[PDB]
Each structure stands twice: as structure tokens, then as C-alpha cells.
Design a binder for this molecule. Structure first.
Ligand code: HEM
Length: 148
């Protein structure tokens, strides 16, 4: 594909400092949907403010986990059906922790925001479109974990 290379090339810049970049993604995420903050429950406690999450080693570990699943999608960009069962089960996990499937649309916007801000003029509309397709396929797979 042409899109496959556009994804690989755009990811390279970001994939080298995944915590820095996933930090932008999650900052944006809570700026858009602060009601996601309480779903990150470590040691029984609730983060009061978005900046509280950034001091949590467990939260930051989660950023790294997210960037690793995205990296798996990129690796597998030419065929994502091989991640389907992994992703379905990832979906069920998130259903279990209280995430509503609709919140994954905000996550997608947050990803696109992060890529836009890292790539600047290199985030062409074809790059956006390609990422939107890839993320969309990921969430389709995950959505099976919420009962189809
Ligand atoms: C609204 C967005 C999200 C919320 C509120 C959320 C919350 C959580 C929570 C509470 C856990 C369990 C605690 C932990 O391991 O940190 C978890 C695990 C995880 N999340 Fe997320 N998450 C979100 C989005 C994502 C996305 C977009 C990905 C990947 C693309 C992701 C990947 C993971 C992985 C890999 C784990 C470990 C799952 C396991 O135990 O096997 N999460 N998430």
C-alpha cells in the first residue's frame, strides 16, 4: 500500500520517544473527556486532576502499553486480522474496567492530535486519512470485546 508506508514513516519520529508522545495523547484525552480520569484506579484511589495522572508510575506504564499496542498495529499494518483476537480481548478488559466503547473515538482524536503536533507540516491529509483508517480498524477489532 501507499498508506502503509505513510503510517510507518510518520510513526518513526514518534515511536522513538513513546512516553513523551503518549503523554501528549493522554493530556489531550483528558482535556477533551475529563470523565475518563476516574477509570484509572490504582491502589483504590482516584486522580483528582489530569496532572495527578502524570505523577503515577502505573499511569505512565499504561501510556507505554498503549504506545506498544499502536506499534503492534503499525508493524501489522498490511494485515491487522492477525491482531484481532488480542484486540478483542483488550476490548473486553476495557469494558471490564469501565471504559465505554464511545470513548475510543476520543482516543482516536487524541492520537491524531498527537501526530499532527509531532509531524507539523508533514501531517498531510493523506497521513491523517491513513491513520484514521488504521485506528478505525483497531477499534473495530476491540469493539468485539463489548459484545460485537
Ligand atoms: C479511555 C481510554 C483508556 C482507559 C480509561 C484505559 C484504562 C486502562 C486500565 C484501567 C487498565 C488496567 C490497569 C493498567 O494496566 O494500567 C488498562 C490496561 C491496558 N490498556 Fe488501557 N485504557 C484506555 C485506552 C487504551 C488504548 C487505546 C490501548 C491500546 C491501544 C490500551 C492498552 C491497554 C493495555 C495493553 C493494557 C494492559 C491490559 C492487560 O492487562 O492485558 N488502553 N487500560
Amino acid at each position: 500500500r501507499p498508506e502503509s508506508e505513510l503510517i510507518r514513516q510518520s510513526w518513526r519520529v514518534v515511536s522513538r520517544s513513546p512516553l513523551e508522545h503518549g503523554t501528549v495523547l493522554f493530556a489531550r484525552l483528558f482535556a477533551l473527556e475529563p470523565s475518563l480520569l476516574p477509570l484509572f484506579q490504582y491502589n483504590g484511589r482516584q486522580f483528582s486532576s489530569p496532572e495527578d495522572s502524570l505523577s503515577s508510575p502505573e499511569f505512565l506504564d499504561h501510556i507505554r502499553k498503549v504506545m506498544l499496542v499502536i506499534d503492534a498495529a503499525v508493524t501489522n499494518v498490511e494485515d491487522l486480522s492477525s491482531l484481532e483476537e488480542y484486540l478483542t480481548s483488550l476490548g473486553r478488559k476495557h469494558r471490564a474496567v469501565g471504559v465505554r466503547l464511545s470513548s475510543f473515538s476520543t482516543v482516536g482524536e487524541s492520537l491524531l492530535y498527537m501526530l499532527e503536533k509531532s509531524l507539523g507540516p508533514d501531517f498531510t491529509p493523506a497521513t491523517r486519512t491513513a491513520w484514521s483508517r488504521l485506528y478505525g480498524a483497531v477499534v473495530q477489532a476491540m469493539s468485539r470485546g463489548w459484545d460485537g
